[PDB]
Amino acid sequence: GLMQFTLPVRLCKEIELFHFDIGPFENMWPGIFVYMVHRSCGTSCFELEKLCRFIMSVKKNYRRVPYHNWKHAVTVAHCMYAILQNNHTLFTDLERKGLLIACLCHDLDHRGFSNSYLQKFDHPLAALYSTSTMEQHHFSQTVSILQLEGHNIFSTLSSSEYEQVLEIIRKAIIATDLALYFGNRKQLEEMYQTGSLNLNNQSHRDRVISLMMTACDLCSVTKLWPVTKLTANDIYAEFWAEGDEMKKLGIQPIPMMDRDKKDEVPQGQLGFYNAVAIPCYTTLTQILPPTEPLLKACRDNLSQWEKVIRGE
Numbered sequence: 001g002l003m004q005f006t007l008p009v010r011l012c013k014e015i016e017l018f019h020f021d022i023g024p025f026e027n028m029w030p031g032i033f034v035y036m037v038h039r040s041c042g043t044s045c046f047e048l049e050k051l052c053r054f055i056m057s058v059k060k061n062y063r064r065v066p067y068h069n070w071k072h073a074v075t076v077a078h079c080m081y082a083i084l085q086n087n088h089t090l091f092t093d094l095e096r097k098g099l100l101i102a103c104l105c106h107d108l109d110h111r112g113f114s115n116s117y118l119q120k121f122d123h124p125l126a127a128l129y130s131t132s133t134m135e136q137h138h139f140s141q142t143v144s145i146l147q148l149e150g151h152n153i154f155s156t157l158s159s160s161e162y163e164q165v166l167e168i169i170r171k172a173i174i175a176t177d178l179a180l181y182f183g184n185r186k187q188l189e190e191m192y193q194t195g196s197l198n199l200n201n202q203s204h205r206d207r208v209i210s211l212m213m214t215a216c217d218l219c220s221v222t223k224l225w226p227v228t229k230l231t232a233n234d235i236y237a238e239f240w241a242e243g244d245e246m247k248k249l250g251i252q253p254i255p256m257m258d259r260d261k262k263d264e265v266p267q268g269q270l271g272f273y274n275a276v277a278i279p280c281y282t283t284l285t286q287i288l289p290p291t292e293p294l295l296k297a298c299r300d301n302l303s304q305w306e307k308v309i310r311g312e
């Protein structure tokens with residue numbers, strides 16, 4: 001059904017840009033993921049029938065929430081695409097496959113509630129996945145969907161190669177738990193500076209991949225402003241929707257998840273960039289220099305928030 005698709009020539013060149021925006025090509029998002037895989041791992045790392053089967057199932061299990069939904073998955077997948085394409089040598093054939101799948105499934109069957117909420121109100125997900133709650137569920141879902149009839153796109157890997165690819169996927173879905181980013185960047189940051197970072201060192205390698213994921217995951221901040229500005233709202237609908245349930249249970253939510261403090265949105269976003277996004281994209285560039293356009297777009301949108309906060 002999908003299989004017969006081919007991307008328009010108008011988009012081939014734009015799709016390679018880091019600041020590419022999938023937004024006005026909704027009914028092509030699956031096609032673009034077929035595209036980004038064929039361009040990266042060639043047209044014969046997955047049987048086309050099995051890839052298309054898998055993507056549409058991935059789509060199915062993305063809910064109709066405001067931010068953590070199928071649009072957000074593809075956008076992330078795209079960033080990693082642009083990262084991988086700009087640093088083609090540095091990552092193994094096997095890693096390229098995993099990181100393009102892992103991104104796509106990184107928020108699979110997401111409920112639009114944080115781990116804070118799922119843990120504060122004792123959700124069964126928090127009963128099972130004690131830390132990194134939603135992030136563990138997300139990987140879980142990749143497993144089941146892979147085990148579905150005719151979905152195992154990796155089935156052509158050796159038994160050992162198969163297990164390596166799941167590890168990579170699992171590690172990269174967990175690293176998108178922002179709680180782990182701070183420590184991950186902190187440790188990356190020192191390794192590079194104290195001069196001990198080493199691609200060859202597999203534990204070192206995993207952190208590079210984890211930060212990559214965090215860069216792709218938040219990459220809405222790296223687009224043209226009228227995209228970035230629109231995307232900001234999407235996250236807040238979700239956040240405030242969380243707060244609102246808390247309130248219906250007698251509980252006051254924190255400012256970010258309280259729609260009565262929406263006049264502070266620029267304030268939050270300006271502080272988010274400075275506390276999270278900028279450091280992320282600084283350490284990504286420092287380690288992966290040709291991926292610098294991200295940091296550049298992140299700054300651009302930062303001063304756009306400045307402009308707003310002080311009224312221009």
Ligand SMILES: COCCn1cc(-c2cnc(N3CCOCC3)c3nc(COc4ccc5ccccc5n4)cn23)cn1
Pocket residue numbers: 114115116178218220221231232235255256261262264265267268269272
């Ligand atoms: C506990 O919530 C889950 C963990 N968490 C997620 C975030 C977070 C993630 N992504 C954000 N993006 C990516 C998409 O483009 C918009 C920015 C993000 N923005 C924020 C905004 O930060 C705040 C902080 C305090 C605020 C207080 C009042 C009004 C707005 C605020 N925004 C938090 N996150 C912060 N903590």
Ligand SMILES: [Mg+2]
Pocket residue numbers: 106107134135176177
């Ligand atoms: Mg997540």
Ligand SMILES: [Zn+2]
Pocket residue numbers: 068072076106107176217
């Ligand atoms: Zn995400």
